[PDB]
Amino acid sequence: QNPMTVAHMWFDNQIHEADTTENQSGVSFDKTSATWFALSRIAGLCNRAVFQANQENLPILKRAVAGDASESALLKCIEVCCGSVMEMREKYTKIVEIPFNSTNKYQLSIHKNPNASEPKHLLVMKGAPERILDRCSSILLHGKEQPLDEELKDAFQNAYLELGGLGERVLGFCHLLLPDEQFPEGFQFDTDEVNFPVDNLCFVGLISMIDPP
């Protein structure tokens, strides 16, 4: 149906819009890409939906999908102007990517990162917003951290619950900026020999959507 977009995202701890009324351009909105940089990195690699290859002559929003039962809307506001995911699949060498199976309700992907302010190894998570929140004890405010607490849980909860909370509708999308010097050059984590933290980390925020116009 029609175009779609994100509309609502939770990044400020308080929703406060996040779509530029009158018409969609960057009229007066700053780039400032800190939270956005992460919310475009995770959002890229940690995706399964694609635009069935690229495009012959025709719009991103009327390609098709290929993908699995999560969403494609997660990607419809990435490949538009945020970056080639079909490229970043190979840009990042893809260290390890623990499956969720049916207990975990989260996935991980470690990955390297050659470029930008990101450490040479990082980690990214996706999965059910609550089941992430279990470990997730920070949140990311305009490139800064904040400590999560019962109050920041509340802010998350009432947001998440406004957005859906039904099933697969809201996802979590978090990361971890791992150390360079204090981690191994051999990227030797494995899935057996983990050695990586799975704790407070950095929640980043909710890449939720809308569906009615």
Ligand SMILES: Nc1ncnc2c1ncn2[C@@H]1O[C@H](COP(=O)(O)OP(=O)(O)OP(=O)(O)O)[C@@H](O)[C@H]1O
């Ligand atoms: N690619 C994905 N990456 C991460 N999480 C995803 C992805 N696609 C869907 N999810 C997750 O699917 C997971 C499984 O929970 P879900 O409620 O879907 O189980 P189910 O097996 O369908 O349950 P039921 O047996 O009741 O139908 C949830 O963690 C949800 O976040």
